[PDB]
Amino acid sequence: MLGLKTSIIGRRVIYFQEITSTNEFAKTSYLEEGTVIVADKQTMGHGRLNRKWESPEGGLWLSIVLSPKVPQKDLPKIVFLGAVGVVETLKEFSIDGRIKWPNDVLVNYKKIAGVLVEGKGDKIVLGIGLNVNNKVPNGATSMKLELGSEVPLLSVFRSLITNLDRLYLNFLKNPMDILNLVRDNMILGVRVKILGDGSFEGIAEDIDDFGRLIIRLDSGEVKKVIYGDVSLRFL
Amino acid sequence: MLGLKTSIIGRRVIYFQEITSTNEFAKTSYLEEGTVIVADKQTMGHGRLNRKWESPEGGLWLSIVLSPKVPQKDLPKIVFLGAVGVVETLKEFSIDGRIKWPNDVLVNYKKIAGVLVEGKGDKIVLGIGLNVNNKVPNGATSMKLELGSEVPLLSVFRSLITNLDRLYLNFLKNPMDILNLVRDNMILGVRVKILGDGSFEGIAEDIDDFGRLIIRLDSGEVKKVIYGDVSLRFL
């Protein structure tokens, strides 16, 4: 009844009035590539390290099953597909989303969306949480708050699915292309603090050919950050 | 993202851009009660006696998984739930649909929808095919042909699911109610013929407490027709 016209992402969509976590359901269940798992609300939504992701009714909480046939070294770029897709959808609705490396989307430095990619081999789950009309925690924002009016949730869904399908199809043929789109939509040229084993500060200059964040410390030392258990903080 | 407010039917919805048959998928897949299987198009859609059901893009082709903890003699009424649900939805859209025993819905005697119920052990699969904006076989009709305009397919889905959930929840408590709703929306008082071995003709008087069609032959003999591989047409 949805009449989606995408090639891979959206071939099938499993909708839930409520679920524990779309990412958990997607990782656990036997699902075909391109299947989208979406729920009105999540009772156990999470980000990295099992951190709580508030998922009340009004937001877009979904996961996509992917089985990218590309080199291993390219797999880490899947998170970027999600971030860019969200940014493109926000721009369609005239909202200025910017990427906070490597998985967040901010609007005026307030978090409007988060991307979580999980994989156990050939099966990769791309999770996306986007605040639309729902109430949000402090430090966050939503499409409704930025526009001053409610936004049809299904319209956001259709837009995002269309963008992700296009981005994914091109990623399979040219896995390097996504990097340019990230650069063009990422917050750069500002001081950041990298949190992990210890921490250091510097100017976020750009991302390299592997998607690593390039940071220039005051001494002039250049560090390349690989995303894993490391958190980025703006000053 | 659909934000369905139903209690049971629609708690989960599995959408397909393309599928062989929603009924076949519902029968062979483990699915929680209330799960709706829906597809833009069916390649192997079928009615009674495996007869092909044209299911092109534009129509509403779906199946609902049920498991009625109701007595053993009420189960044949499930088909009526589907038929009445369709009639109610059509009325909301300014269309007067009437039920042709035992599973068809006609508009000015042209078929606009068909219902197919298949009980498979534990669960019962309620299949409904409704012509909305799609092309239909000669002699048939659609909501678009009746209204002369493009009808939003998702709005029809929402309406039907809402009606079915209400009808089903009541059916679980008051299983006899559906019979009177059928009687008041069924084509009666007309002549019909029953094909096959031992064929005969007569006036379709009403349906009894078991949903059997009551026919009065010209001799005065009364026959009761059960919903089997029964082929019934008007005269």
Ligand SMILES: Nc1ncnc2c1ncn2[C@@H]1O[C@H](COP(=O)(O)OP(=O)(O)O)[C@@H](O)[C@H]1O
């Ligand atoms: N709906 C929401 N919108 C925005 N931020 C949220 C929401 N729910 C939770 N958060 C915050 O966002 C964090 C998201 O995951 P996290 O793994 O910390 O990564 P990030 O580095 O992107 O902040 C949570 O720890 C929480 O503080």
Ligand SMILES: Nc1ncnc2c1ncn2[C@@H]1O[C@H](COP(=O)(O)OP(=O)(O)O)[C@@H](O)[C@H]1O
């Ligand atoms: N999209 C459609 N709309 C209306 N009628 C259809 C459609 N596709 C098939 N049919 C008709 O419906 C039949 C299948 O359902 P069935 O309940 O056995 O009713 P019928 O009494 O018409 O044979 C097919 O054999 C065909 O004649």
Ligand SMILES: O=C(O)CCCC[C@@H]1SC[C@@H]2NC(=O)N[C@@H]21
């Ligand atoms: O900000 C992050 O660190 C990522 C948050 C990802 C949230 C989404 S909501 C859909 C999917 N299901 C989950 O339990 N998490 C992701």
Ligand SMILES: O=C(O)CCCC[C@@H]1SC[C@@H]2NC(=O)N[C@@H]21
């Ligand atoms: O008139 C009939 O015989 C009933 C037709 C039922 C058609 C629907 S379309 C959704 C579901 N999937 C199928 O293959 N058949 C039913």
